[PDB]
Amino acid sequence: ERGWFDILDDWLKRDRFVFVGWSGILLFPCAYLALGGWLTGTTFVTSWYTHGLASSYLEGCNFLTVAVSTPANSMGHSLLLLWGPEAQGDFTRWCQLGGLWTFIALHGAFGLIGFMLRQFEIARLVGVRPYNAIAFSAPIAVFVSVFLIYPLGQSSWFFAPSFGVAAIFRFLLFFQGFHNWTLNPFHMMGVAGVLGGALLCAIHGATVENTLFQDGEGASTFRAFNPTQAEETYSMVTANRFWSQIFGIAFSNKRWLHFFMLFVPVTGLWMSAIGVVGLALNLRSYDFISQEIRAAEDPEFETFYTKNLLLNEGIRAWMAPQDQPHENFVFPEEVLPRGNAL
Amino acid sequence: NFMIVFQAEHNILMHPFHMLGVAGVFGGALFAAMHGSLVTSSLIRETTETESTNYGYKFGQEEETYNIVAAHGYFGRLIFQYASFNNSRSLHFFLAAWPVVGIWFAALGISTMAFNLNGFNFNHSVVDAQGNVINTWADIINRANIGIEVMHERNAHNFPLDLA
Amino acid sequence: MEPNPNRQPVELNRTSLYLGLLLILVLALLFSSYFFN
Amino acid sequence: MEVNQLGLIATALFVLVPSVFLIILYVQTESQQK
């Protein structure tokens, strides 16, 4: 006599090839549906009625151009449930209305919650501190700010990113032309965290691999390591001296080193999420007012900042009619901004 | 400015070496956070509740400062056992190789678009039964590229093609 | 008063000073342009 | 250039207040008994 809850807990936490856990009850269906929804949509489903776009292998797109695209702007921020008032239970119409986008976004969100819960659950069962879960808060902040908060601030899900390779590239250029997102210091901190994280990844791996102790006779040195060994496999002292003499400073504390490798990319992604939350409201770092006052009064004053705004104005005018079809933009040839000859 | 003009003139976003570059820096950041979090997760208790755990490691000590078997036991259960590194030399070679190769390809992207072998062009690749173009997201990218093209260096071109 | 037993000394080592000053100065170098606008 | 007149005081205090906080903590760590 144990009690069904404890008996279920036993079975959920059995040491098996794929750990399940309580968290798996949330994780596995939502991850599978998000992934399955994306594969289904990119293989078979159009974007003709929401965007005027082909978007599936069935229509002739390739891996770079397929997408599961956002619903039409006229849907607003509708949850677009299969049984909701828009599709009314019709699976085919639901697909044509963009229901697979909210299907993927929402199962994806709950799947990410399930995964972070899995990180906590496994850490607790194995007895390690849950820093991997904490580091994962950065992917979650990015997904939530970009795929949920940003469209929720705009007119509709239509302006969220569509789930596709080229669709995402379009999202990047939209953010340049409309938000001047490269000028945003929260994006800049994000860039620093990503490139700084990649730098730390490379330099730490390279440093370990080139300060190894000779622990075997092979010219291939991977075999000379034992997971249960007590000794460091590389020389922290020699690594510290090398970088001190090359670069001026070096790590001396292995624990700080590895925390810093987490801190840098995690903090960078968190900062980029904050900037996108601002962009949800069009609270852009779009301009420098002093630059605009000077340039408006002085037609000989030019900087790279004013040069990039001209590019943005080109992006907006030339991409908006096809990119925002619900607006029914007709821009006669004569109003399109353009330089000489081109 | 360099980046935006480059996109109009080479469609670098649609070039697979820039894609490998992005995988390099996204993946490098991911693996940095992963490696950092797994080692931090399994530090051996060597400090009191007051002091920073960083004092639990002394510069130049001979013994490892974390339990790599504990770290592997967590990560092998997070995904599956054989997806996890138990060999620290293999692990750190991978940490070196992934961003380095990714950035090699990024650099080769710029260095070969330097000779105008440009990103994939699927402009008007999808056509209906009559012959009407059915736009894809690639065509929306092209509209942004054109907007950059016509505006950049607005007084510098006298002839219809920007050939360099 | 009788002494409070929950007090603890606080520490900031030199490396942490250098890291913190670097963070602050670089954040200031980054954000100052937007403050002047 | 017609910059915002509060940009100078904003930047100065942004630098000074947290830098001073760290200097206070560092110096009083050094002065503790070794």
Partner: peptide
């Protein structure tokens, strides 16, 4: 005044580099 501010912060950073390298906490084996 804005140029002075930018150059001042930059100069403080370069000074910090100097102290961080030549007046670091010496790494010590124990």
């Amino acid at each position: 005044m804005e140029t002075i501010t930018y150059v001042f912060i930059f100069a403080c950073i370069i000074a910090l580099f100097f102290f961080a390298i030549f007046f670091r906490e010496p790494p010590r084996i124990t």
